[model samples]
Target chain A: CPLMVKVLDAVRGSPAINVAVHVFRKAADDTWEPFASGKTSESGELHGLTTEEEFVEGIYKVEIDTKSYWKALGISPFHEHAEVVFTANDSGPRRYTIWALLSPYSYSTTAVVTN
Target chain B: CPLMVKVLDAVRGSPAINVAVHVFRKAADDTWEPFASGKTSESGELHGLTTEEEFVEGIYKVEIDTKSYWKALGISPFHEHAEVVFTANDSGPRRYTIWALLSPYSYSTTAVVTN
Candidate 1:
């Protein structure tokens, strides 16, 4: 996969499973158009979101539905959702993985990328 | 102060200095109203962004200017910026510290909250 996500639960100190992720590419008109979507698997990964050919250079947004994830666990969270917006592959084709750490009142996101 | 931010540069393995940060609160009309803005200090922290009494319970957004930071370092990055949005103090008064880790193409954010 050219793009992927790995989410961890800070409170639980483990993978955050089943979180919904929505991927969008910025249109020429500066609007966000949906490109792909998925849910985190058992290991807190959402792979195969996009292929190299389809995910060309552009600005992209990744939205994580965090509210439902915490609600399901009976925890009231502070974030309605978590979002990351970035420009991708400007130099050339590359791989990207977003790593997120979540808590009821706090969350952290970081990305790893390679050619 | 009730809200603060700490930023790190993953690539350099040190604190990110002089990065810009903007804070906003959601209004009754669902539009974001600017509240505060600052730059990271020498230690990569933006302190005193808000006060305990002023930062009442509500949705807030914190925007980090990652693009400018990378550009200053002559790095072509993937993210235009990084953002964190969430409901704050729904239960009661609390303290929030947002920690962000940044690279050319990847970034991670996590929150630390307390009473």
Candidate 2:
């Protein structure tokens, strides 16, 4: 039961390939905080982003640095990063997936709870 | 008839307050492109991001550089920016409102067809 993340390019809907992503959680003191980070694999998937630690049922966020990726490809990105927020509930799911769809100009994401 | 945008901080559900935002319109060659850019006002609203130029259908994007704003406040943002993408349909609305919500570590957004 880990937190999984996938990054894709909206241009051709292909795997983003080696994108830097970070995971953050809300602390008990109600302060903003980050705990772990990872990079997308060749297939644009980063598994165990939170499974390596604790996956709680509260506020969690994912930050994708697409600007550096786009810059490496010699292209100008619309924004420097993609900040995604979603709620993790007290569901009995074994894994949670955060899908990040990105373009040079736009980005979108969705979260799924899977058993 | 114009394009409008707003940014907000999700920590306390308040306007993001002067976030730097950029807009990019898809080019004919389907390359990553941007033409207009602006900053949110005191109320976190950016008006005429595209209306000053041309608001057309197809692929469009908005980039919010929240990192700079956070840095000024002595904070480490989860991500450097929020890249939001949506389709601007040829509707009968007067303005397209892109509402961006942000937190220190997360962000979300929505679109409204306004008159």
Candidate 3:
């Protein structure tokens, strides 16, 4: 395992369960190619998005289907989706975790990179 | 003024100066109409983005040009830009302050809505 994503609902102060997560890697020509996808668990965690070997060293993008999550709870959201883009494994293989806080009208995300 | 934006550089643990900020409002046809724009000050804040009377009730988008900020320091960043979208002044006239944290490979944003 190499990467993990955690989602939280700011309004409810709880985990955002079942929110969709999509991962993409940038190709040589600067185009994004799909790599992996999953949904958050009951604890709002999506683990094992990619393995260390397959993840490699490159730029990656993570898209959080936030609108659908709010819509399911009967709230109309503003952003169609929330996305994070960054270089991965730049200083050799490392573990990364993205923490995202969601709201119908707002959201926040941060990343923790480690050994 | 009804809206403000704050940007921080998480990597350096300081305010992100001169980061460009652009705002757009959703039109009747669901298209985004340019609304307002500014740059963060030394305190990482862009104030007076809009007035309470003109802000009105609608969906709005705020785009933060983050890449250029990091690039200015000769560091390559991940996301080309950071954005926040949400509905404003829903029940009555209110004020909003969007706070964003930026890094070369990570970022987070949240909103504080007030009366």
Candidate 4:
């Protein structure tokens, strides 16, 4: 399945706006190894971070690089890293969308699997 | 170091009431196995989930039970789990605090070491 992530600045009610995000896949050694990383667009959205081969049903992790992103904007760091955990269901869905709301100090995300 | 965690509602500006949060320590095999779990306080706080005779420095993971918490308040499931990844620094401090801001959809956290 192909997955896209959308992030919003909850305090501003707009897209998170070019924040860096990292995606990690759980490896056989059980380590969450970084498989892909990218920056959000002007609309606080991104896609095609995972173009290696294919998607599988497994545990996944996403971490937002908020420390540097917030620092550049003159805001003090709130968290070292903001991350989320979810399952990538490839058996039924061909595409998935993750919606995220973020702030200098906090963040949230919702995943919708498209069948 | 002894660690305490506090979770809040970003939208409401209050503690995340009655939310369940899980704490995990990365093991030798790089697997994050659940070590401690509990619910947030009326003030969205928890302490002393690990009292196993000693403290150690390592990678740690915290997962909030957002699905069950939001469902009780009539909010549909957003992300499967709102989780954070960080380290427990034992060489420098004896106390630490993890602060989290959570909503029905997104969540963020900050860890402060109290020396």
Task: Please report the candidate that would top DockQ against the real structure.
Answer: 1
Predicted complexes: DockQ each: 0.53, 0.08, 0.36, 0.37
Error of 3 at A8 (Å): 1.6
Query: How many residue pairs clash (N, CA or C atoms closer than 3 angstroms) in each of the candidate models, in the order given?
Result: 11, 3, 0, 5
Q: Name the weakest run of 10 consecutive residues (lDDT summed) in model 1 chain B.
A: B86-95
Ranking by TM-score: 1, 3, 4, 2
TM-score of each: 0.81, 0.53, 0.69, 0.63
DockQ of 1: 0.53
The candidate maximizing TM-score is 1
Residue range with the least summed lDDT across 10 consecutive positions in model 2 chain A:
A85-94
lDDT by residue (tens digit), candidate 3, B7-115: 9998788999999999999999888899999999999999988886688878888889998999998997767688777767466656788888887866777777777
RMSD of each: 2.9, 11.7, 4.4, 5.4
- Estimate, for each residue in B1-76, the C-alpha lDDT of model 1 and write its tens digit: 7899999998899999999999999999988999999999999999988887788888899999999999999998
Q: When only chain A is evaluated, what TM-score does every model earn?
A: 0.97, 0.85, 0.97, 0.85
- For model 1 the TM-score comes to 0.81
Error of 3 at B88 (Å): 9.0
Greater-TM-score candidate between 2 and 4 = 4
Error of 3 at A47 (Å): 1.8
Once superposed on the true structure, which residue ranges of model 1 sit more than 4 Å away at CA? A10-14, B10-13, B51-54
**lDDT of each residue in A1-115, candidate 1, tens digit only:** 8999999998888999999999999999987899999999999999989888899989999999999999999997777888988878878888988988887866667778887
**Relative to the true structure, how large is the alpha-carbon lDDT of every model?**
0.88, 0.71, 0.85, 0.72
Rank candidates by lDDT, best first.
Answer: 1, 3, 4, 2
Residue B102's lDDT within candidate 4 is: 66
B59, model 3: CA deviation in Å? 9.0
